[PDB]
């Protein structure tokens, strides 16, 4: 009766490497961070999620045995922040979207924000309703099918170097229509200051722009914003292009 103790003992060995892959996704997501989750039931959830997705059978012996343990955790954490930074893609540009509309209207010149927090929460809920959580688990269940440890898979550097402009060109075209009207209104006001010299249209520009910068985006808030949220959700089919195992 010695192997029965080993079955629960092989599981708890298997959960440590399972914790190191998926824990920094539980730091990145807006509905799962330490700001939204307490301390006592946090470490209960993160353990049992990795138990339901682990690819190998639990009662079998793990291939972890004294190969290279301190570098293995930094491998699995480094691929973990990759799954975090791809899954938090459409929330990052949406939080980047609200900062541009906040910054153009004034309201941030106390440096030399609450509104940008509002859009990031909004795209969190509309992503979570239709499907949502079914696709967040599917990409890490497939990740164990193509990045099983003791094989040293890496996040594949040469398509990583365009990641920042990839969200940037999604940032500029999403903030495209509201910055053109606010900018054109200012020089239109500026041509009236050339037509009436002591208007001080800089002071007048701050009072009128916050109503204008919010009004034009109400017209395409309903039909245009929430479908791009579901389109920009990273799906499991693209998992081949970001990884390869090294032996």
């Amino acid at each position: 009766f010695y192997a029965l103790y080993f079955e629960i003992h092989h599981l708890v060995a298997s959960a440590a490497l399972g914790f190191a892959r998926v824990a920094p996704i539980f730091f990145f997501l807006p509905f799962l961070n330490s700001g939204v989750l307490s301390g006592a039931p946090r470490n209960a959830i993160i353990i049992l999620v990795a138990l339901g997705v682990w690819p190998h059978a639990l009662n079998e012996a793990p291939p972890f045995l004294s190969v290279a343990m301190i570098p293995l955790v930094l491998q699995e954490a480094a691929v973990g922040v990759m799954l975090g930074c791809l899954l938090s893609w459409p929330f990052w540009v949406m939080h980047a979207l609200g900062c541009i509309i906040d910054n153009q209207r004034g309201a941030t010149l106390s440096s030399s924000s609450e509104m940008a927090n509002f859009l990031n929460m909004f795209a969190a809920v509309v992503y979570l309703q239709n499907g949502g959580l079914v696709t967040m688990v599917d990409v890490l269940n497939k990740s164990y099918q193509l990045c099983d440890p003791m094989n040293e898979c890496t996040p594949s550097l040469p398509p990583l170097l365009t990641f920042i402009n990839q969200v940037a060109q999604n940032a500029l075209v999403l903030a495209s229509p509201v910055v053109l009207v606010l900018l054109l209104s200012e020089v239109f006001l500026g041509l009236l200051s050339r037509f009436a010299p002591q208007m001080n249209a800089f002071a007048i520009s701050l009072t009128v722009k916050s109503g204008i910068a919010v009004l034009i985006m109400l017209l395409y808030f309903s039909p245009v914003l929430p479908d791009n949220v579901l389109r920009l959700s990273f799906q499991a089919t693209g998992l081949s292009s970001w990884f390869y195992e090294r032996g």
Binding site: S38, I45, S110, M115, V125, G132, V137, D138, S210
Partner: protein, 221 residues
């Protein structure tokens, strides 16, 4: 008979971590930190006391569920004569907890994990189970509690988004009337804070959100 007592003490040690995961305490705890965050107060209202008030309602709802465990296990006819009926007996003991998990969890998210565990179990050649199992077949208890706790995070975040709305509509009109004047170099969060506290006490959100959650699990009269 004696090692049945060993099973009780071994059951006793992992209890509050089941309360950390299995019950609906995870629903009450999240929305109360969010109402701390939505009001902008950081340390207050001192969430150590907020753990106590969130626990007492959840036990108050979970009590008819856990009370049936005593009456099922203090029976004088625990000891059977066959190895499968006694394991059948502990199954029919756990069913009152189990169907509560069935009612309040998501359909497809639990369904994803059995298909995910079987291809882990045997391999890919095992054919997948579809939605139509639900009428006859019951899943395991270890494929339930992952999908339960994530689903309640979804529902708690549904609530946490909603009462974040009537405070942030306030937080933009204060930041605009301050820029209606030339008061750009002024911290608007210190003016929004009085009218942030009145909108919860004039609406009296404490004494109606607390009543709202108990109707989502149980009924009255």
């Amino acid at each position: 008979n004696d090692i049945s007592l060993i099973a009780l003490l071994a059951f006793s040690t992992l209890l509050p971590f089941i309360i950390a995961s299995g019950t609906c305490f995870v629903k009450f705890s999240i929305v109360f930190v969010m109402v701390r965050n939505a009001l902008g107060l950081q340390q207050i209202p001192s969430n150590m006391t907020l753990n106590g008030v969130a626990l007492l309602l959840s036990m108050f709802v979970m009590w008819p569920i856990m009370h049936d465990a005593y009456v099922y296990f203090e029976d004088e006819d625990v000891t059977f004569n066959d190895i499968s009926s006694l394991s059948k007996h502990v199954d029919e003991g756990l069913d009152g907890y189990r169907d509560y998990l069935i009612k309040y969890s998501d359909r497809e998210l639990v369904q994803f994990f059995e298909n995910a565990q079987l291809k882990r179990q045997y391999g890919e050649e095992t054919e997948t189970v579809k939605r139509d199992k639900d009428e006859i077949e019951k899943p395991s208890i270890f494929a339930l509690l992952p999908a339960y706790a994530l689903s309640e995070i979804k529902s708690a975040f549904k609530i946490g988004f909603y009462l974040y709305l009537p405070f942030v509509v306030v937080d933009l009109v204060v930041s605009s009337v301050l820029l209606a004047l030339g008061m750009m170099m002024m911290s608007p969060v210190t003016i929004s804070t009085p009218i942030k506290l009145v909108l919860f006490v004039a609406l009296d959100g404490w004494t109606l959100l607390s009543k709202g959650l108990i109707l989502q699990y149980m009924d009255i009269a």
